[PDB]
RNA sequence: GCGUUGGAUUGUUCACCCACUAAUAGGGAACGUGAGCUGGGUUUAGACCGUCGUGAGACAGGUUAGUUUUACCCUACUGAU
């Protein structure tokens, strides 16, 4: 089975159950990669913004910015619910 | 022209207080004066704490411990032939 969802034809052997399970696995893993990368970037940029005006602190944070830029160069629908209705609903006789 | 202080806390400059006093004026002289002193502070190397840092370490912050050499020359000055 071959899917088109990201301008790439992804070809995994099997059925929609196996393909959907495999795609859910890879989406979970790439969400975790994306999440760890943005947590690390958030920590680095937080220390960089924490450094105010000094010589030593801005040079340490400028070093961390070099590390960060080196890392950057290395890389539905809904149903509205029912009213409370008695159990007899319809009677065709 | 002559005089403008004694003390407490602080390394103090400044400071504010107690007390006397006629008065408790302000300053300069390489911010007088370290081959005149002292070396409390600052500001090498030891060490502690907080904060920041992944770390080595940083501190706009605190605390302690830390060697300060020579005149017999010319001159100036004071005295002496």
UniProtKB/Swiss-Prot annotation:
Interacts with LSG1. It is found in: Cytoplasm; Nucleus. It comes from Saccharomyces cerevisiae (strain ATCC 204508 / S288c) (Baker's yeast). Signal peptide: none annotated. Disulfide bonds: none annotated. This is ABC transporter ATP-binding protein ARB1. Present with 17600 molecules/cell in log phase SD medium. It comes from the Eukaryota. The chain holds residues 293 to 396 of 610 of the full protein. Belongs to the ABC transporter superfamily. ABCF family. EF3 subfamily. Transmembrane segments: none annotated. ATPase that stimulates 40S and 60S ribosome biogenesis. Also involved in ribosome-associated quality control (RQC) pathway, a pathway that mediates ubiquitination and extraction of incompletely synthesized nascent chains for proteasomal degradation: localizes to the ribosomal E-site and stimulates VMS1-dependent tRNA cleavage.
